[PDB]
Amino acid sequence: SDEKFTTAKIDGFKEFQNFRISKEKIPPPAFDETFKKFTFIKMGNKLI
Amino acid sequence: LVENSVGYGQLVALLILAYYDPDNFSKVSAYLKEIYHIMGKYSLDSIRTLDVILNVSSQFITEGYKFFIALLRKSDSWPSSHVANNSNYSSLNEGGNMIAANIISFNLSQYNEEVDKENYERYMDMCCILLKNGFVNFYSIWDNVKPEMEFLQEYIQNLETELEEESTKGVENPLAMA
Amino acid sequence: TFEHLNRDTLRYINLLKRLSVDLAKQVEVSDPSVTVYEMDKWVPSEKLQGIL
Amino acid sequence: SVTSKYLQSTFSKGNTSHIEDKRFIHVSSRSHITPNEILSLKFHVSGSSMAYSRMDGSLTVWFIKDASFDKSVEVYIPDCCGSDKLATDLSWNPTSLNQIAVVSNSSEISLLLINEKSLTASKLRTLSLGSKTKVNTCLYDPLGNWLLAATKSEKIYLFDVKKDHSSVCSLNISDISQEDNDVVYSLAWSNGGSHIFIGFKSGYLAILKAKHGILEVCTKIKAHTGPITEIKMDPWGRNFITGSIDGNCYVWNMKSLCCELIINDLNSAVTTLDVCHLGKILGICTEDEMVYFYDLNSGNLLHSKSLANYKTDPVLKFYPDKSWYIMSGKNDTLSNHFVKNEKNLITY
Amino acid sequence: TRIDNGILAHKPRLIHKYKTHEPFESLELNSSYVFYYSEWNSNLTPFASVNDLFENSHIYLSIIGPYLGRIPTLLSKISRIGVADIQKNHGSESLHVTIDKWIDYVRKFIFPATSLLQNNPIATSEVYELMKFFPFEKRYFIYNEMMTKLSQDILPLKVSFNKAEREAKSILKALSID
């Protein structure tokens, strides 16, 4: 860790210049809570 | 570390003591006062000393996590008026201690040498513990670890195409071929 | 005096969990139901505990 | 990988002794014939005795005192349980150190106390039931508290061994199966007599409660698609292993009763199976004259062999007090196995 | 059990407990390993009624997706819960309501999963032991929809179907009297 911190200081601590702090407002997600419907074809396919 | 050797020496030695103490749990305050006395005497930094605590703590995290969390909970490097939640969709990115976030997001992207590949597990586990008691908010860690979202999406498209092809077309497993 | 007191404190704390020496742990359990024993929940007899 | 090396060493040039029985010297004299059989072979609990019964009618019992059967006495006895009738199953009565229960596909259960000073096996008692009833399997609760006797159809009896084998209860198999013409194929006790596990032929598996001496049907699950051959239990008491004839070997979790691990390299029927006293290695004897040794925790093959058309029907059994196993040889002759310097796996 | 001085003596087996970082417990031949962070399940509350099972299926299972098949035991547990729930009210008049609701559930969450399995009969046996309670029209509906619309237009299902089909043809070319 000391070696890594030395080589990071060498470049002038540029590795901490970029940090990307998020600023969005996170909304509560929506979950589909419904089941699909069934067609008119009682059996599987038209022929049967 | 090499700049004020004596200084860090004392600190890290003291830290080992705390994890080898049977009554360490009821002497949190004495340890915090000792660490402040030391950090004062030889003018250690706050950033580097937080890192030194994190490393030799993660080294004992398994069966030290109780005392570790109590220690950080009582030290003034703990965000007390804007504590992160990490358990509510509307607050996954608000609050925390952004300096600890910087140091952690840094130490989590070093997997190039050979020595850290064997401690990445314990370090990730310590961060995962800290990341649910509100020490740092999640997105502040997510947005800053190594693989960028674009490279992830590229790897994803490659895996999707390769999988779909190997599924639909298929591949002949050579039994006695050639 | 302060230096002696610091060094003695480290020895005492070291000498508790780290350099402690403990009992043999011979085990015999009366209940027939107990078919598996933890081997860490073994404790010494109450009479011996008072003497210790 | 320690276990693989251990098993390889157990299959080496040395570390193996021929069990010198009547059939062994017979083959030695006639080779240097039609092999009768080995109907059954079952240890004592304390790992210091062994018993088995060929098809001729004679049951041999050894008092293990040596590794390679050097100083092991042998009480050979002629065709017990009648001259016409031969033994089919025996239980070793974990209560005492000498008693034995033996059944001969008849309505009579023979309790004999084997003596070691002489070579005399003296009939101690005979138990009888309905005249038509033809029981063929006997079992002992691993605490020596209940005895079970089962028919190929329409009879199951439980005696209380403590109170001089007073007939405690019975049950009609048709009440347990409720299917078309089922024939119980294999039974087994739970660790500590509390439940009886029964495997029918139609595929079903039933769990009966035998807590206070009154049988009752707890549950029935459609385990397999063919007849169930063997049912074994883990010694630690966390899972029970089921092996079938359809080529499957499953291990069911004990607390929840749901499949947890499956053996998939198998492609043939199972004739028997056994698991070591440490609950670590699982030995499968399939029907293509081949044995396999799997690992219980992971479920991947760790050793294979080949019987090579010698003694078509094989037998396997792991010691209850050491990591050794008796396995059949060439012509219905037993073949011990050991390492001679490792009593248990842990010592290795 | 051991024979000492010519008498039987029973003893219990002795094991010890170790703490590791692997999540799943085990017992390696003398000692039992456990996950160290023994209060990881503090933030979660188990279900109290099958209605809660629906309400939380809509969150966890809709995420795990067609990959539920990677854990067979969950299929068995949910299917046995369904069987017992249908059996509990065989007498009552509202049975057809529960039957319709479990029909929808098995259509949307379980059957796509069981379509992914690999040479594991017993799990399918359980799912069918639950399915046995429906009108056969509905079973044919589910089977045909799975055949026509969900094999295509979903990647991992398509991969598994193609693998199974190629394997079936490969075996069919090698059937003999010998």
Place this chain on the structure above:
Amino acid sequence: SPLLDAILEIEENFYSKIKMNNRTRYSLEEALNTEYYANYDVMTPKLP
């Protein structure tokens, strides 16, 4: 050189005392039970 020599000799004496205590205790507790077969690998300290 001699400084490090002496200090490492002392640390050796230290760990020797620890290991002697633990080994004697384990041998006794092993020979005192039926099928204990203690695990000599782990040596982390534990409160008596």
